[PDB]
């Protein structure tokens, strides 16, 4: 494989323009640790360069999609450094779940395979599409762990989750199955877990056949457009699509 | 009829309070071209100022609503002039789509009979209420052309679709029913064809019966009130309820 | 009872760390006079500052949740003063029904135990979290009346009701039971009226259980992420979570 | 002329790709009737698509720029017609004043002569730039007429003039000098009465030897940057640099 | 008088419409304790609904106008009590600083008679207009304390001063002058002391003399449209004016 | 020195914990170029973890600051590749000018002793003060180049610059000097360049003085408080004091 061996954490492996990107920490439930989070900026960095993937998908090792961050991993190197150090592990996480992911240059789909707690919620929302199992389990744990959600997590579930939804499980924090992920909107579909891969496949060639420039300012702008008025809108989506006629030449 | 033959691809025709509005270029599925957007500016600024037309309908000729924008005649229009055309052809096609429709001093109702594709969709959100056909079709085919959605397709979807729902759509350009419309929340309702009419009738006629300055006053500080927060609209709202006792006397 | 005869218009009960307040003028379906409006943003303060107090239920006698603001008394109180009264008489329903209530220090569940009418949405969407009973109604009657909602009735559908059928509502003024609030997300569920109040305990428990700094950080964050873009978020969520900390300890 | 005798309120000179627009009613003190508003919105379309003009000068006749609304003419087309008739009349105000005019196509150049007072500040701002007179003079007279600022007024000495000195002046209506409006921010210069046209000219034929639509990417992009945040606008402005690109 | 001996730690003189509202603890420079918060809340409400009171003057007794948060008394009322009475003091000092005061219902004037430290700033800029002595000296000293500022310390900065200067005076909490103040935009004007007082008695019987509801649209109208976008406006700003003419 | 020969485009000096940061291309004018872009980036997250750094200073090696963007180096490597090389160029751009910089954890101080043209507008403003050289040239040049502001810049001025002045200078693409930087507000104080090495010197060591993470609270708050309202405000800057006293 072209990437083999190349991360600790995490295993790329491209098929026919499409980079499957596993977080691969199976024993800890890819719990999301600070070498996890520099590893997968180096992913998102090299994967926008590499001509052969058009699309991403984000899926886990074994049966966790991820368990969220890696408790142990990040307090061992944030108590071993300066207060500095926890601006630093803050950034790393936020640059790969969301600041290249979120508005990521390819189409992205999280394909969640099993847990997904906590800290997942970012990339989860960040990636532009997401299938479930059924037999998933998603939950906002925070609560009973003495934290409120950290990161973009609360973002994540005011994008995608009505008002009610999010605040119940944000202020519950009890679980939920892929069905009622994608019920609740949080995912576009919840297939049986033999079913997810050939499902989360066909969107992902989908993806590929249209042309990349476009997509881009399509899906990207769709994300922007959200926060903008009709009037601030006429002007910036005319100029993305006229951004798009000059980067497709 | 009052409004005949006053539009050469546009028809109006008054009943009792309701002015349906036809777009009419049936053999061209009522796409939009640069004629039709100048006319559809008169017609709306004719509109609010007959005071036998109380509530608006837009629907399309034959078995579309609108395919969305004509591509033949936009380019044969621009290609033609200086690049300052295109600045013009633009502002028309957003100056009756929504910046006269989406905060129309009158009820506004969509009713889609069929087709509704891509530029369409900007209208079909500017009308405060839509009702479809289960046999109407939808969908954003810009990504297929190879153009992001132009004008304010995007923010008329982030209006009213959640998120992940409008970005497959966005980003596939898969088509959808009727049904899936209403469900995913672009329309109020799907109904069949056969029973459109009635549908749009008895709700325009509902309308038509409520005091037209508090149902301006209403329907518009609702749609503004989505952009403001909740400080801002203690302020906004009682100002708009103000604003409507001054103007019902 | 600690509460007992203290306000006129509205009772309080505390039984195991849950504060049931209860709008109580059921002969008028309490609707919320000016009298009311004081006596409540009293009751929220009272309860702030009481230890035994770690949930507030605000639940309706008789028949009633409310049927909104008390015509005859608002303007009796209103015609009787000089204009700078009303700015005082909106500031007071304000002050109750979202200033402190939207963002309290405690978790809070609207029980919707009958009639929800006009202004009883602003507090409705207030508190985090509803239930209703399957044989409440519910409507935006304001227009029938003749005036667009008033105070944050608006906004409060914006942040919970899909945008058609928000202003389907508050255009046309119809009623809606139970059920139909819980599938348009106005609350997060309704269940038959012999078990309300049961199911509201459950879940008024269940918050009791958790860390009260940590529940309001994760509660009141949410609703304040839903303003911010992802970039701002990023700095407001974290001083959220380390504030929780800070405040924990 | 190109342009003589076509509109009623409104005068167009156009010479060395220069459209010097002068509001033309100097005995009422170039009051923007409702007349006014609509010939005003026929000027600009019609001048956007006059390629033989790549900058507007918005100036007055007489020793006004505009006194602001023609309160007289206003309320006899409103008091006439339904509720409705002052919707149209508000939205052709708002439509020349701003919506064509902040964000218009060419280069504005607000061109102060004389007095400009209260709706006047809607155009003043939504141009490019201004200059003005020492000798104009300047006043929110709403307050001392019993309403608040109309319109964009309001909004338009946000943009332009810090928060204590845009609530002293719209609080107490005083009137303030083309020294003090420049001293502000509301204008860019003040200069001699005798020196204003051919200052504005000087300045005109400089923005001429731009790109036309370099130009309109650069000012317009940066009106509206001023909304945004900077991770909005890392996307925003370079999506403008790529428009201009494509366009030029 | 009217209010005498009504509060511990504030004075209200009513005169000719005018409250004159004095910040009284003279010898602890008129610091903002939990007690003078709760006095001024109840100062706020009291004066909107004096008929008597057109216009608010907030000033300090003494060489003081506010030195701030009055950190002792803070700690003795927190430090006694659960958490949650941390939430209630914040809530007090906020209510009378801005959430009654920016907004208010009638013109407010700061007059800044001498120092004016960290949390003065809040109710510093919710005040309409202001004015200060040449002699006043202003200072963000949070930074030497070992907090960043506190309440809306940092956003009334934000609205009155630049970026840079905001965030020198933020950074270093180095002291600057009346005539300082005023260059910058926190205040309106600065003016001897000797001449303070009548300075803002003359404009506040100028406010005096506009229509009282109309000034309140005018005013806090112009805040708020700050927030809002020219196409939000339109809608708002006609709404605070269609507002007024109900309301007057 | 502990950075000697680290950086090709760079040099850094510490002493007294100041990190002293010069762009050194000088025969270029220290143009931007995408290897000063990448080393700018490891530099600012090199000192960030440097225990021995508590403020940055960025100036430029030569009689430049930076010309701005090196057209020649960028165009070198987009047209060498494909599209999507153009997406990561831009993006190591933002992050060192403004990304890292803008929020920095350290104090940051621009000492702008020479020209500084188009892109050097962004991380000039993304530092928290600035202080140039009288006899620093700065311009909006992009107009002449034919390309609007890209980038930060427009949005670097709308933050800084008034909006007449900033219009006026991106329309016209004409050049100003230190005092005229100052009077703007684009820089804190333009002093003669042979005091503005010393003055940098001793606004830095003022800033070492205060506890770093009151100081990073106390800046970056204020920085995103201009983009909330008051009420979000309420909320914000007491969690970021809050967190300051957890952090410390």
């Known amino acids: 494989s072209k990437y083999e061996g190349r991360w600790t954490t995490v295993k790329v492996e491209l098929e026919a323009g499409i980079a499957w990107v596993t977080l691969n920490r199976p024993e800890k439930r890819n ?6 989070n ?3 900026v180096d992913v998102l960095e090299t994967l926008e360069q590499d001509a052969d993937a058009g699309v991403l ?3 886990g090792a074994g049966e966790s999609w991820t368990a969220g961050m890696d408790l142990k991993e990040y307090f061992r190197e944030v108590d071993a450094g300066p207060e500095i150090l926890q601006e630093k592990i803050r950034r790393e ?3 790969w779940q969301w600041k290249l992911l979120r508005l990521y ?3 992205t789909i999280a394909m969640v ?3 997904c707690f906590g800290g997942g919620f970012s990339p989860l929302v960040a990636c532009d599409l997401a299938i479930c199992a059924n037999e998933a389990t998603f939950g906002l744990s925070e609560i009973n762990w003495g934290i409120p959600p950290g990161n973009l997590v609360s973002k994540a579930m005011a994008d995608t989750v009505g008002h009610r939804q999010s605040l119940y499980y944000i202020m519950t924090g009890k679980t939920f199955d892929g069905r009622k992920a994608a019920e609740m909107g949080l995912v576009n579909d919840s297939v049986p877990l033999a079913e997810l891969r050939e499902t989360t496949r066909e969107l992902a060639l989908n993806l590929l056949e249209k042309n990349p420039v476009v997509l881009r300012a ?3 702008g769709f994300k922007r457009c959200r926060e903008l008025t009709w009037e601030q809108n006429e002007d910036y989506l005319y100029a993305k699509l006229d951004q ?3 980067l497709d030449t």
């Open 93 to 95: 996480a936020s640059q």
């Open 244 to 246: 798009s006629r000059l």
């Open 218 to 220: 399509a899906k990207n």
């Open 105 to 107: 240059a390819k189409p």
């Open 38 to 40: 520099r590893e997968m």
């Open 113 to 115: 395979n099993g847990w």
């Open 31 to 36: 719990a999301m640790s600070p070498t996890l």
């Open 57 to 59: 998908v984000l899926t």
